[PDB]
Specification:
The complex is a heterodimer of chains A (about 210) and B (about 220). Chain A is mainly β and about 210 residues long. The longest helix of chain A is centred in the middle third of the chain and has 4 residues. The radius of gyration of chain A is 23 Å and the shape is elongated. Chain B folds into two domains: about 120 residues, Immunoglobulins (Immunoglobulin-like, Sandwich); about 100 residues, Immunoglobulins (Immunoglobulin-like, Sandwich), CATH 2.60.40. Chain B has a six-stranded mixed sheet with strand order 2-10-9-4-5-6, with no helix packed on it. At the A-B interface, β4, β5, β9, β10 and β12 of A face β5, β9, β11, β12 and β16 of B. The PDB classes it as immune system.
């Protein structure tokens, strides 16, 4: 199969900016590549075919060009509707295959996460489960890592994370990380720790509780 | 202005056949183009499934070759997808699209969930700070919503009288059922002095659970 590598996988940009997205195929595709836009929530619209040709209804601030295994898409004077995900697709050979997309996101200032940790509720504990929740809210940029510790020991199994789309009013991201344990194991440890590593700090933001308190 | 619209079941049990219809208007499926099925997985990756050309010839992605069939009905101007032996990794959004001058015309997409689950109302657990961690200026509360099906709960904080930093986190599959959470940030003196209440609606199971959030 022809493998389509799309660069970059995301981009933070402002209205009026010019943006440039590229696509690499694992083999020469002789301009049999198109470009697609998926607005957020929405369906797709075909932008460009044959490397460089506009589909009908596509404004001329969209343009592409390439040769061989390397092709780009340029969007000049970005408008608010242009914030969307963009994919290239090759149709030089079957099966037809897609790049992984480039998300156009809105630029804002760096913001630290507000980190909050919560112990299992009694009620949950009643039913034999114990989920430890940690919100990491209103941060920027979207790159973040979350580490759990139980009595100092780092913990990977049982962690599930869920990220929101870029916020429509402030343009930050949030995640929840949930550490799910049996009520049994939970009652066997004291300190639960959720650490957020982010760009806006040289050092993790730590939040903690003790099972034994209160 | 060439329109395509998908229809068919959006819930299919594993090992049954997923089946869908694309309904074309404003152009003839006999007259030009390839008529395609493309699916988008959760996490957004795209996969070309196959097509049937205007002359009725088919091509299928070898990755699905043994379980895919694409057909049409020239008199209704319709083509169809059937996808046998589905499993939960066949949960995706299905699009039919015309190829020819790239991929200009797309249907609106239809998500199809492949699940063995039965309708299940959620368990709703309130999320309040564990005492000890005395706080600053704002206070973050939440509700954890576990073990429901099908998807679509709506978490309304007060009457919506709050979207002072209401965050809704996308559901994940956990144990065959869905789990999501919601957070809400309020000033650290509006609570606990005021009632903070998270109301969780699951219309598929005709159920709404309200939790009033409690200190310590």
């Amino acid at each position: 199969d022809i493998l389509m590598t799309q660069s970059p996988s995301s981009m933070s940009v402002s209205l009026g900016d010019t943006v440039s997205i590229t696509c690499h195929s694992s083999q020469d595709i002789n301009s049999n590549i198109g470009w697609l836009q998926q607005k957020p929530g929405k369906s797709f619209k075909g932008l460009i075919y044959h490397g460089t040709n506009l589909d009908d209804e596509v404004p001329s601030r969209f343009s592409g060009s390439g040769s061989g295994a390397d092709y780009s898409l340029t969007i000049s004077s970005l408008e608010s509707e242009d914030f969307a995900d963009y994919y290239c697709v090759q149709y030089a050979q079957f099966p037809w295959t897609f790049g992984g997309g480039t998300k156009l996101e809105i630029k804002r200032a760096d913001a630290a996460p507000t980190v909050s940790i919560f112990p299992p509720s009694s009620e949950q504990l009643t039913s034999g489960g114990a989920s430890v929740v940690c919100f990491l809210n209103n941060f920027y940029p979207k790159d973040i890592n979350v580490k759990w510790k139980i009595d100092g020991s780092e913990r990977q199994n049982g962690v599930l994370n869920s990220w929101t789309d870029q916020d429509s009013k402030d343009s930050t991201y949030s995640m929840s990380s949930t550490l799910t344990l049996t009520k049994d194991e939970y009652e066997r440890h004291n300190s639960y720790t959720c650490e957020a590593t982010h760009k806006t700090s040289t050092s993790p933001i730590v939040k903690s509780f003790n099972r034994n308190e209160c | 202005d060439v329109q395509l619209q998908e229809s068919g079941p959006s819930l299919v049990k594993p090992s049954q056949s997923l089946s869908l219809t694309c309904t074309v208007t404003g152009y003839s499926i006999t007259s030009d183009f390839a008529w395609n099925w493309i699916r988008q997985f959760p996490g957004n990756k795209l996969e070309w499934m196959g097509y049937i050309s205007y002359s009725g010839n088919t091509r299928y992605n070898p990755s699905l070759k043994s379980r895919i069939s694409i057909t049409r009905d020239t008199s209704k101007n319709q083509f169809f997808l059937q996808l046998n032996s589905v499993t939960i990794e066949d949960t995706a959004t299905y699009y039919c699209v015309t190829a020819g001058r790239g991929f200009p015309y797309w249907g609106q997409g239809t998500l199809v969930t492949v699940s063995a689950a039965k309708t299940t109302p959620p368990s709703v657990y309130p999320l309040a700070p564990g005492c000890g961690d005395t706080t600053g200026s704002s206070v973050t509360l939440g509700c954890l919503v576990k073990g429901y099906f099908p998807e679509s709960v709506t978490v309304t904080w007060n009457s919506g009288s709050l979207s002072s930093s209401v965050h809704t986190f996308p559901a994940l599959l956990q144990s065959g059922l869905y789990t999501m959470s919601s957070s809400v940030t309020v000033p650290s003196s509006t609570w606990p002095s005021e009632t903070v209440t998270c109301s969780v609606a699951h219309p598929a199971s005709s159920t709404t659970v309200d939790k009033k959030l409690e200190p310590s």
